[PDB]
Amino acid sequence: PTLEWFLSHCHIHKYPSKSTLIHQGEKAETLYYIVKGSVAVLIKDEEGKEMILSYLNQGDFIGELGLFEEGQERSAWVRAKTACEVAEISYKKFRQLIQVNPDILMRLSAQMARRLQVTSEKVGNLAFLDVTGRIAQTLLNLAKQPDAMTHPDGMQIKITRQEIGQIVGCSRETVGRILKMLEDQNLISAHGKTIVVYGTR
DNA sequence: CGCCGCGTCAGACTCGTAGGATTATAGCATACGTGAGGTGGGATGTCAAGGCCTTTTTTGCCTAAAATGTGATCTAGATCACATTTTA
Numbered sequence: 001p002t003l004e005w006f007l008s009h010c011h012i013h014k015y016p017s018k019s020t021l022i023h024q025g026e027k028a029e030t031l032y033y034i035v036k037g038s039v040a041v042l043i044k045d046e047e048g049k050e051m052i053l054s055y056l057n058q059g060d061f062i063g064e065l066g067l068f069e070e071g072q073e074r075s076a077w078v079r080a081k082t083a084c085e086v087a088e089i090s091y092k093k094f095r096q097l098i099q100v101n102p103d104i105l106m107r108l109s110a111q112m113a114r115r116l117q118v119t120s121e122k123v124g125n126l127a128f129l130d131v132t133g134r135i136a137q138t139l140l141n142l143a144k145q146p147d148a149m150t151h152p153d154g155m156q157i158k159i160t161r162q163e164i165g166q167i168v169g170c171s172r173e174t175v176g177r178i179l180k181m182l183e184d185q186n187l188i189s190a191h192g193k194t195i196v197v198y199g200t201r
Numbered sequence: 202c203g204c205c206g207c208g209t210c211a212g213a214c215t216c217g218t219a220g221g222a223t224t225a226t227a228g229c230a231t232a233c234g235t236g237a238g239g240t241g242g243g244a245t246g247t248c249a250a251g252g253c254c255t256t257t258t259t260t261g262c263c264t265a266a267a268a269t270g271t272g273a274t275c276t277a278g279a280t281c282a283c284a285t286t287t288t289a
């Protein structure tokens with residue numbers, strides 16, 4: 001199928017890595033759909049410290065809060081993880097798309113459900129567990145991804161101490177120190193950016 | 202029977218236009234009723250304060266009882282210039 005009917009009518013566009021997709025503060029007039037690739041959600045503060053909120057791969061909806069409320073502003077940042085490709089259409093078409101067949105917003109409603117529940121796990125994990133707790137649990141989390149690479153003893157993923165520091169919200173170097181604590185306890189290996197995780201599977 | 206005289210009876214249809222009448226007629230007195238006017242007066246209608254009950258607004262109050270304060274003792278986060286070191 002039915003998505004064929006949907007993207008048969010959409011306006012199609014490509015864009016490179018690290019381009020700014022959505023600007024925090026611009027008007028609510030366009031929905032977007034990741035056709036190919038992955039993308040990352042972050043936010044910004046008075047200080048300018050960046051805080052990665054989420055990250056999503058192919059098969060997800062982007063630009064969903066402003067669809068209903070006339071003239072909302074963009075409540076976060078979203079920047080390209082890699083060079084990736086998207087289809088887009090504005091809101092006046094989507095009333096034609098919900099009034100004719102409401103299945104699209106069922107799909108949106110499900111992915112938005114998983115979204116808000118992992119946001120509940122997010123705010124709880126941020127709330128109560130110590131630094132080791134939520135860094136460990138989020139490590140377990142991105143071990144899940146399709147982006148994660150296979151390893152005969154588990155998995156392996158490429159990431160810097162900075163960006164993981166931006167999902168837990170602490171300094172890159174203290175993440176270095178707890179990474180050393182987890183190497184001392186014989187649970188994770190790492191060289192530079194390439195971390196290798198045991199315990200999976 | 203068959204005139205002749207007299208009399209009776211119809212004379213198309215829808216619209217428009219104007220305002221409109223006239224003569225002369227006695228006079229005064231009696232006496233009675235009805236119309237336009239007063240007039241107190243039941244009686245109705247109004248407007249401002251008081252006694253029955255319930256509801257509402259303050260307001261007692263009743264005890265569970267969870268909350269709001271006391272402050273010295275810590276803790277697990279958080280930094281910054283130098284020394285590399287990794288990755289597209």
Ligand SMILES: Nc1ncnc2c1ncn2[C@@H]1O[C@@H]2COP(=O)(O)O[C@H]2[C@H]1O
Nearest residue numbers: 041054062063064065066074075076077
């Ligand atoms: N809690 C969140 N989780 C994931 N993405 C978010 C969140 N908040 C905002 N965004 C993203 O930021 C975008 C800002 O504009 P939209 O609300 O149209 O769509 C939003 C999402 O793509």
